[PDB]
Amino acid sequence: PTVEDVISQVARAHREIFTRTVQEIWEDFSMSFTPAVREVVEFAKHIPGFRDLSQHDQVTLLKAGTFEVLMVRFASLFNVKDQTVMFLSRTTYSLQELGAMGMGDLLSAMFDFSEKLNSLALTEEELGLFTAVVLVSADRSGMENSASVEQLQETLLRALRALVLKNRPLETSRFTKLLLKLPDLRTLNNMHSEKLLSFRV
Amino acid sequence: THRLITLADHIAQIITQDFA
Ligand SMILES: Clc1nnc2ccc(Oc3ccccc3-c3ccccc3)nn12
């Protein structure tokens, strides 16, 4: 499809789908986190070209890039000034209150990343198109057909280039600043994807 | 009474369960 078809479709799905004791915090986390992951999978279906990939490649991409998508999606839920993170159930928590989980370092890394992402002032369209780019930009190890994924990545990368130029033409490095978040996201995934979660058994 | 699992494995668990 055309670049304006990609922006319109990806941004529409982005609005439709996305937009105090240790044990109780882990139940609120689990009940917020599980639908959040499902939302990434539903958003992925609505990405022009994603369903055309083989079932294996779709699952491989979602398994590799869902943590990174959640870091971008949850970035706005981190209040850098108040030092408060809100969960998908509208419950707000202090950093200290949340220290009783494993993470600790993941939560402070998230405050820095959201702050960095905030300085860009992405419009909803831009954020939705970046979220799609993040998902298709995951490690392509174990892909039956990496070529199909690379072409899906460049289709979303061209639409993001155009949207960002349409919005802030004078800010010629806006696209660059967005591609520069990719190794930051890759470091956070490499540093924190192995951290442990607790569930009532 | 409590289960422990990495962020990656729990994500992959939700994914493989959703693709049924
Ligand atoms: Cl659940 C849920 N629903 N909304 C929010 C908002 C923030 C939040 O952060 C976390 C808190 C504890 C453990 C992991 C994360 C986390 C997971 C993936 C990517 C980034 C962070 N979890 N959360």
Numbering used by the authors:
A (entry chain A): 283 to 301, 430 to 611
B (entry chain B): 2045 to 2064
Task: Provide text from the study.
The nuclear receptor REV-ERB is a component of the molecular clock that regulates the rhythmic expression of inflammatory, metabolic, and cellular proliferative genes. Genes directly regulated by either REV-ERB, REV-ERBα [NR1D1] or REV-ERBβ [NR1D2], are typically transcriptionally silenced by the receptors. This is due to REV-ERB functioning as a ligand-dependent transcriptional repressor with heme as the endogenous ligand. REV-ERBs are particularly efficacious transcriptional repressors, and they lack the carboxy-terminal activation function 2 domain required for coactivator protein recruitment. The REV-ERB LBD displays the canonical NR structure composed of a three-layered α-helical sandwich, and heme binds in the prototypical ligand binding pocket of the LBD.
We determined the crystal structure of a ternary complex containing the REV-ERBα LBD bound to the corepressor NCoR ID1 CoRNR box peptide and the agonist STL1267. Except for helix 12, which is naturally lacking in REV-ERBα, the overall three-dimensional structure of REV-ERBα displays the canonical architecture of nuclear receptor LBD with a three-layer α-helical sandwich and two stranded β-sheets. The C-terminal of helix 11 assumes a well-defined extended β-strand conformation allowing for the formation of an antiparallel β-sheet interactions with N-terminal residues of NCoR ID1. Besides the β-sheet interaction, NCoR ID1 contains a carboxy-terminal four-turn helix that docks into the coregulator binding cleft of REV-ERBα LBD, known as the AF-2 surface. The ligand resides in a predominantly hydrophobic pocket where it makes primarily hydrophobic interactions with the receptor. The triazolo-pyridazine group of STL1267 efficiently fills the narrow portion of the hydrophobic pocket and forms π-π stacking interactions with Phe484 and Phe497. The global receptor conformation of STL1267-bound REV-ERBα LBD was very similar to that of the apo REV-ERBα (overall Cα RMSD of 1.07 Å). First, binding of STL1267 stabilized the β-sheet region (residues Gln493-Gln506) through hydrophobic interactions with Phe497 and Leu498, which is disordered in the apo REV-ERBα structure. The binding of STL1267 is quite distinct from that of heme and where heme binds proximal to helix 11, STL1267 binds distal to helix 11 and is deeply buried within a hydrophobic pocket surrounded by helices 3 and 5 and the two β-sheets strands. STL1267 binding induces an antiparallel β-sheet formation between the amino-terminus of the NCoR ID1 CoRNR box peptide and a β-strand extension of helix 11, which was not observed in the heme-bound receptor.
